[PDB]
Amino acid sequence: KFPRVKNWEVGSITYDTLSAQAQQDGPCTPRRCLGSLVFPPEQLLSQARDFINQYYSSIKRSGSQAHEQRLQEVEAEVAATGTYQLRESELVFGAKQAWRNAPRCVGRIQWGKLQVFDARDCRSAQEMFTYICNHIKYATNRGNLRSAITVFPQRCPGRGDFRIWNSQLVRYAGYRQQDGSVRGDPANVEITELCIQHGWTPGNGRFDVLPLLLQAPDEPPELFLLPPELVLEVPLEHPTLEWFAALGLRWYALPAVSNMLLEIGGLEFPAAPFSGWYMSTEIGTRNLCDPHRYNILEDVAVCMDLDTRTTSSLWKDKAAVEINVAVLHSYQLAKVTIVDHHAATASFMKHLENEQKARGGCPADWAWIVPPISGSLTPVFHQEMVNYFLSPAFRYQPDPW
């Protein structure tokens, strides 16, 4: 009744008693496992009591005066208004816990260090842009990246909502041709089409930084040229392959997800961008080598004069490793926070041991924690993991169209 979890490298066993708190049902049934799939009125009082109890237990103040008090005012707020406002300290606690509960994040060893900006009195895209711009420069911090989340107003009935129409705050463009294919990033060919449609002059480059499309409630989105000084980017060069610089590759410093719905205590924030710092396989393996992304793998292999005529030469594996080397080398010479996948997974193993002592386990999505190159060379590969949904949480949400 409590899942037995083994680590096959060392042979240690733990039990995930924490999984007994799984709220939102997952996709799996005894008949079939769906773990490999990417996207698989007064109910607000159940989700709020549980959250407020979470807060006070975590400050050793369960079951004492201040706990009762906070229970009544949310009772009376929703009674009067049909929703409630979070205290500053609660929202801070809610933000850090959602990160801590994100089963796909390998960087949660950092969950306790999180800078929370409160944009709950926001109104109009003119202010949105400023709140985002405060975040970006704070998080970027001239290359010493700092984790941050900005929280725009929550959701109320009978009124439109705040949304960042882009998936991230920094994304490159994707342009079709006289032949359908793409110059730039193929992942963003849709939002790129929206920006052009909404009044932005298309560029001629593989690495044009898209403009933001920000949406105040019930009003049509507005384009916003991000200040180029605010967008810190890293030209890519290799330590010893002098020609690599010539391939003209860049990536941007700050990975800032802007499309996920933060959910705290039954309250929903459709705009709540969080940012951290990249793990290098994200950029070098996925962004640049995925066949449907920049798909640079064979071009780096020609430059290395590899045998691309036979798969058993492992030319793919070789080119990919050096691409990752160039990424790490480039972020370090530019002095931008980045972590390699060996350091990151080792830290996650340390995270799991922390969490086992602290909360009785940790929800983890094996298919996403295990890096996309050299999987079984990292210790998470040999760690069994239990996936489930805890609250508060980051959730995916529809696109607003």
Ligand X SMILES: C[C@H](O)[C@H](O)[C@H]1CNc2nc(N)[nH]c(=O)c2N1
Ligand Y SMILES: Cc1cc(N)nc(CCCN2CC(F)(F)C2)c1
Which one among 203, 321, 354, 360 touches a copy of itself, defined by CB under 8 A? 321
Among residues 70, 100, 108, 171, which one is catalytic?
A: 108
User: How far apart, in Å, do the first and last CA atoms of the chain sit?
Assistant: 43
Listed ranges 47-55, 77-85, 100-108, 171-179: which one lies at the site for ligand HEM (CB under 6 A):
100-108
Is residue 393 within 8 Å of 21, Cβ to Cβ?
Answer: no
State the DSSP H helix or E strand holding residue 223, giving kind and residue range, or none if neither. Answer: strand 222-224
User: Shortest distance, CB of residue 267 to ligand X, whole angstroms?
Assistant: 28
Nearer to ligand HEM, 283 or 301 (CB): 283
Name the binder of 381 from ligand X, ligand HEM, Zn ion, none, CB < 5-8 A by kind.
ligand X
Nearer to ligand X, 7 or 115 (CB): 7
389 binds ligand HEM (CB under 6 A): no
Report the distance separating Cα 26 and Cα 42, nearest Å: 23
Nearer to Gd ion, 246 or 367 (CB): 246
Residues sharing a CB contact under 8 Å with residue 93, sequence separation 6 or more, in sequence order: 54, 55, 58
Report the distance separating Cα 203 and Cα 69, nearest Å: 57
201 binds Gd ion (CB under 5 A): no
Among residues 90, 222, 282, 322, which one is catalytic?
A: 282
Look up 282 and say whether it is catalytic: yes
Residues sharing a CB contact under 8 Å with residue 262, sequence separation 6 or more, in sequence order: 94, 95, 98, 149, 151, 268, 269, 272, 392, 394, 395
Exposed e or buried b for every residue in 208-242, given b needs 16+ CB within 10 A?
bbbbbbbbbeeeebbbbebeeeeebbbebbbeebe
Residues that bind a copy of itself (CB under 8 A): 3, 5-6, 8-10, 16, 19, 22, 25-38, 280, 285-286, 289-292, 297, 311-314, 316-318, 320-321, 324-325, 328, 332, 340, 342-343, 346, 365-367, 370-377, 381-382, 384-388
Q: Which residues define the annotated binding site for L-arginine?
A: 168, 277-278, 282, 287
